[PDB]
Amino acid sequence: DDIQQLLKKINELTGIKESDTGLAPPALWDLAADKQTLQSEQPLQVARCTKIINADSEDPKYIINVKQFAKFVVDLSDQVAPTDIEEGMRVGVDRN
Amino acid sequence: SKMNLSEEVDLEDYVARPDKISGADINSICQESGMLAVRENRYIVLAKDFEKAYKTVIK
Amino acid sequence: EFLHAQEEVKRIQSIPLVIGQFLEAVDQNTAIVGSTTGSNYYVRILSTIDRELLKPNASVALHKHSNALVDVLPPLTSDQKPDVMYADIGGMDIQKQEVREAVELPLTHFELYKQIGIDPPRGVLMYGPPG
Amino acid sequence: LRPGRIDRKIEFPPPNEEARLDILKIHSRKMNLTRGINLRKIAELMPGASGAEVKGVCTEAGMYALRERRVHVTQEDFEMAVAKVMQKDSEKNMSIKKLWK
Amino acid sequence: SKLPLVTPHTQCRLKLLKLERIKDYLLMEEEFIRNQKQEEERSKVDDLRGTPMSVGTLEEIIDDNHAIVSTSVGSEHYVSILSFVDKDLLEPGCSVLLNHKVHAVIGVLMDDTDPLVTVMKVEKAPQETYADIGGLDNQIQEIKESVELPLTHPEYYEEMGIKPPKGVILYGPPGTGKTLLAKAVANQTSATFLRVVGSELIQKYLGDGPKLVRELFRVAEEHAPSIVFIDEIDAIGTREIQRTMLELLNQLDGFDSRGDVKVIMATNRIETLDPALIRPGRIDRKIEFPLPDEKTKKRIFQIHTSRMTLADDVTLDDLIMAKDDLSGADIKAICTEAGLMALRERRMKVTNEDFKKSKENVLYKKQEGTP
Amino acid sequence: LQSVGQIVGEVLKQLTEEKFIVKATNGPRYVVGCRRQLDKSKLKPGTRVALDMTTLTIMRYLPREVDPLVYNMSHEDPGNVSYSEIGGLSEQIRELREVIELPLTNPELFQRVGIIPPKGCLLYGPPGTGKTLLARAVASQLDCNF
Amino acid sequence: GDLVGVNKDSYLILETLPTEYDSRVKAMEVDERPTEQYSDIGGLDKQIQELVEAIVLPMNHKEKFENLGIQPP
Amino acid sequence: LNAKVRLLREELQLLQEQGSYVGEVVRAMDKKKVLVKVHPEGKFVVDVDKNIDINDVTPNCRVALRNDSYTLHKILPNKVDPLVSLMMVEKVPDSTYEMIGG
Amino acid sequence: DREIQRTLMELLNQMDGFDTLHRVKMIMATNRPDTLDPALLRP
Ligand SMILES: Nc1ncnc2c1ncn2[C@@H]1O[C@H](COP(=O)(O)OP(=O)(O)OP(=O)(O)O)[C@@H](O)[C@H]1O
Ligand SMILES: Nc1ncnc2c1ncn2[C@@H]1O[C@H](COP(=O)(O)OP(=O)(O)O)[C@@H](O)[C@H]1O
Ligand SMILES: Nc1ncnc2c1ncn2[C@@H]1O[C@H](COP(=O)(O)OP(=O)(O)O)[C@@H](O)[C@H]1O
Ligand SMILES: [Mg+2]
């Protein structure tokens, strides 16, 4: 009985066994690049594209169907091009 | 009672008649007689309506 | 100053307030409530609320912003409601008496017949031709 | 029932005179009974009860009290109750002494 | 971890001494623990993943440090991966930590779903041992050659060029020690043990049969050295249930490479099983568990009544004799029933008559035929 | 463009003459008050009302939802089918017009007679005998809402 | 049952949209326009004629049918 | 009177604070980090506050959080309400040997 | 398959809610009346 109770005491003293998350070998990673990229880029949401309105082939106005959230009429950024996007296409969309 | 019926309706005939018809059959006869009365567009239920309803149903 | 303060306390539970359902109390000044938004929260109880009203399923009203429990709201399946009366029945007087003693009195006054100690009535049989 | 499996069996024959005495007492403990009752005659008059029907006889005596709006039970109430509790008089010529005699 | 094994069982000073040594070591552990940096790496990583951090599911990896991730609200997000996340630990379906504000992928959370096979992982194998099973010498050698030795010592088979046997069937009357031997071989080599007893893989849904087989073998592969014990293979083995058979057979000897997982199946009715299920190419070792003979029955009686306090008068041989009509499970029932008879009479120390009455009653618990 | 949309929602128990329980369509349950001037008697459990989406106060009790699914289920072309286009069903047309047309066209008959009109009719038969045609004709001929 | 683009916050309607059915429904639409000729079909001339007269003729003319008063198949 | 006024003032000041959510812990993962699942927000990892008594925090504790940053606040009473078992389980029944006769 | 039964329940309730005064009538058409639930068949 004393063996058992003091084994509980050992468990309490050593505490909960640590649970990790996976941070690779320490020498491999970081650099200021990670935090800079985190604070500088945009964590885009994912959407289905739909019904490229293309009302004039000048202001295309594509519809998107971001799943479980909403659907929006939206436009391209200054980077991507109309020939890049098609109907469907599973586009990526900025968050605000 | 909730229906209209005419003064010449003879309920005692159907009371005494032998056919062992049920209360649901009573309701069916009364609704069907009202329907016959409406069929002839007559706003009141006549004895002939009860006659036709009684023989139209049961056995 | 106490009149001012009590006026503010009253001003706390003014409309709009989000309705929710009361879960079991934690302490004298706080309890857990599940708002009708679906989410659950651990919320301070307004000390003005009378505690006896806090049944474990009571509908309550919370501050819209802070979710603060600030009010207690004062609280059939189908056409199962038959909507027919003894006046509508065609004079089944003997059956009327039999059924009325069989179920109606047990439904209305089963506590006295429990005082008898009998596990008050549970089942009656009705037999006869259809319709 | 094979030996490595479930280990024991217990038999529950129909209650005897003494068992009928207990069960009648236990289920009558809550019911308002009256002096002059003779429950032993009642237990003797119910041969081969299964126990549950003794809860039944108590229930029927109380129902006889209730339908008369009486909150007390007497010997006669139980005695006419037992008649309703017979229900085995529905045996008769069929198989009573032939075939499955 | 667990306490070591104390293997005197009679209450004697040796047992107390062993327990005292265990006590002393554990007290020194108490003393040691009671008798009592990387802040740069912390302030970098554990502060980039600023608390709180959410948990979501990785769907796909598109670039070297960019992944598609879902969350409990069902939304979908293309988000970068910071460099410290182990790429090879990241795959579709993996639970992933995310920064709360910008959803950044900040570490894989070790899986805590797939609960069915999660509990199916036994890990409680140490209740039995080769010592606990007696008399199955040839069967012990067969199972050792078949499932154990390839796991403990694959060296012989790789040197010889043999691809070792990797599927076994056990058959015989019930209570002869099939499940016992399975658990014992699970214990002797500490490769993890998975059990799933026959009809329990049969399911009402169209999917769950073959799906259950697939995830069972998937987890067996994931644990790598593992034992899969299909008890009562009969129920499935004797269109939908045949499809479950097809999936099990394909997972036994099919496409890909199965790896290190060993498969042991147990049946009472081997002759009734479908020949496809017993793939002579795959099921290359069939092991019979016949009813115990005299030497075996003596061994089983000895092991099971060993932990019992015994009187002088017990004539163990006369207990055995007979015509070998009782398996080991019946013998254990004899032991328990004799113990109960001894307890009824207030004997805390069993006698011969207890065993005699026990065997007579247990044998009375057999047969129903009059002629 | 300066205007802002109001939140729709069904209403429930009137706690007082001023505090009401609205239930925004697919949303939470609130306790709210009518604005200042709206009627209070007509605000009964089961009246669609608009809510100001800053204080959630009741304003502009709307008549009731049409649910454009239902709008499509009414404003659908049934065709020009007349009774003289259906053939061989004369008795069945008589029954259908007696159960569905006449109780609607002439309710006072059933009022005076006191008969509760049959609630509905069931049409059944092999595929392609006129059931759908029967319904089409009844729709195209009876000037009502179908 | 119309499709309108409204303000993301004030929810005022400021655009009228073409109705969208579903992505799968649009995937069902033929864009490649396959090329197998009628001459490539052998022996089926009676079946070819039946299918053509049933399908293509109502698309082509509608005059030969309406001059007869028949409902085209 | 002053005590009552102070009481009311502190009550209002606390009433300004929000509802702090309700969640249940799945696995403690070392000091200053513990995992907890909350209604459909989901499962989040959270740093414990100054009370820091994590070994008290058993899985399925029904622990309370912060409304912002979710910071652990206090353990709360346990969720028992075993209606899942109670549709079928008879708990500790009332049947007792004295009502058994014969 | 569940939602269909739960919806037939609501159809039953709304059908039984017909007070005598509404000028509302209803037609139902089917090719397999045998498959129809006998609940509807009740007067
Ligand atoms: N009595 C009739 N008089 C004229 N045309 C009829 C008659 N019966 C059937 N038809 C024709 O046959 C076709 C029957 O189509 P319809 O959809 O009405 O049949 P249905 O049996 O009610 O349908 P469903 O199979 O969908 O239950 C129509 O083209 C209709 O013109
Ligand atoms: N004595 C009666 N008086 C009036 N209506 C009756 C009577 N008996 C039956 N009905 C009619 O029968 C219907 C109820 O069916 P019912 O007869 O109770 O079914 P069951 O065949 O199971 O007895 C009611 O709509 C009612 O109109
Ligand atoms: N050779 C044996 N040695 C020790 N115990 C045995 C032996 N054979 C059977 N047993 C007893 O039988 C039980 C195991 O029965 P087993 O044959 O594994 O069940 P199953 O027939 O379901 O596979 C154990 O409790 C064990 O005590
Ligand atoms: Mg149709």
From Swiss-Prot, chain A:
It comes from the Eukaryota. The modification N6-acetyllysine is found at K67. Disulfide bonds: none annotated. Component of the 26S proteasome, a multiprotein complex involved in the ATP-dependent degradation of ubiquitinated proteins. This complex plays a key role in the maintenance of protein homeostasis by removing misfolded or damaged proteins, which could impair cellular functions, and by removing proteins whose functions are no longer required. Therefore, the proteasome participates in numerous cellular processes, including cell cycle progression, apoptosis, or DNA damage repair. Component of the 19S proteasome regulatory particle complex. The 26S proteasome consists of a 20S core particle (CP) and two 19S regulatory subunits (RP). The regulatory particle is made of a lid composed of 9 subunits, a base containing 6 ATPases including PSMC2 and few additional components. Interacts with NDC80/HEC; this interaction is detected only during M phase. Interacts and SQSTM1. Interacts with PAAF1. Directly interacts with TRIM5. (Microbial infection) Interacts with HIV-1 Tat. The gene is PSMC2. Signal peptide: none annotated. Belongs to the AAA ATPase family. Induction: Expression is not cell cycle-dependent and occurs throughout the cell cycle. Monoubiquitinated by RNF181. This is 26S proteasome regulatory subunit 7. The chain holds residues 50 to 145 of 433 of the full protein. It is found in: Cytoplasm.
UniProtKB/Swiss-Prot annotation, chain C:
Coiled coil: none annotated. It is found in: Cytoplasm; Nucleus. Belongs to the AAA ATPase family. Component of the 26S proteasome, a multiprotein complex involved in the ATP-dependent degradation of ubiquitinated proteins. This complex plays a key role in the maintenance of protein homeostasis by removing misfolded or damaged proteins, which could impair cellular functions, and by removing proteins whose functions are no longer required. Therefore, the proteasome participates in numerous cellular processes, including cell cycle progression, apoptosis, or DNA damage repair. Component of the 19S proteasome regulatory particle complex. The 26S proteasome consists of a 20S core particle (CP) and two 19S regulatory subunits (RP). The regulatory particle is made of a lid composed of 9 subunits, a base containing 6 ATPases including PSMC4 and few additional components. Interacts with NR1I3. Interacts with PAAF1. Interacts with TRIM5. Interacts with ZFAND1. This is 26S proteasome regulatory subunit 6B. It comes from Homo sapiens (Human). The lineage of its organism: Eukaryota, Metazoa, Chordata, Craniata, Vertebrata. The chain holds residues 71 to 209 of 418 of the full protein.
UniProtKB/Swiss-Prot annotation, chain D:
It comes from the Eukaryota. It is found in: Cytoplasm; Nucleus. Component of the 19S proteasome regulatory particle complex. The 26S proteasome consists of a 20S core particle (CP) and two 19S regulatory subunits (RP). The regulatory particle is made of a lid composed of 9 subunits, a base containing 6 ATPases including PSMC5 and few additional components. Component of a complex with USP49 and RUVBL1. Interacts with PRPF19. Interacts with TRIM5. Interacts with NDC80. Interacts with PAAF1. Interacts, in vitro, with the thyroid hormone receptor (in a thyroid hormone T3-dependent manner) and with retinoid X receptor (RXR). Interacts with ERCC6. Component of the 26S proteasome, a multiprotein complex involved in the ATP-dependent degradation of ubiquitinated proteins. This complex plays a key role in the maintenance of protein homeostasis by removing misfolded or damaged proteins, which could impair cellular functions, and by removing proteins whose functions are no longer required. Therefore, the proteasome participates in numerous cellular processes, including cell cycle progression, apoptosis, or DNA damage repair. Belongs to the AAA ATPase family. This is 26S proteasome regulatory subunit 8. It comes from Homo sapiens. The gene is PSMC5.
From Swiss-Prot, chain I:
It is found in: Cytoplasm; Nucleus. It comes from the Eukaryota. Component of the 26S proteasome, a multiprotein complex involved in the ATP-dependent degradation of ubiquitinated proteins. This complex plays a key role in the maintenance of protein homeostasis by removing misfolded or damaged proteins, which could impair cellular functions, and by removing proteins whose functions are no longer required. Therefore, the proteasome participates in numerous cellular processes, including cell cycle progression, apoptosis, or DNA damage repair. Belongs to the AAA ATPase family. Component of the 19S proteasome regulatory particle complex. The 26S proteasome consists of a 20S core particle (CP) and two 19S regulatory subunits (RP). The regulatory particle is made of a lid composed of 9 subunits, a base containing 6 ATPases including PSMC6 and few additional components. Interacts with PAAF1. This is 26S proteasome regulatory subunit 10B. It comes from Homo sapiens (Human).
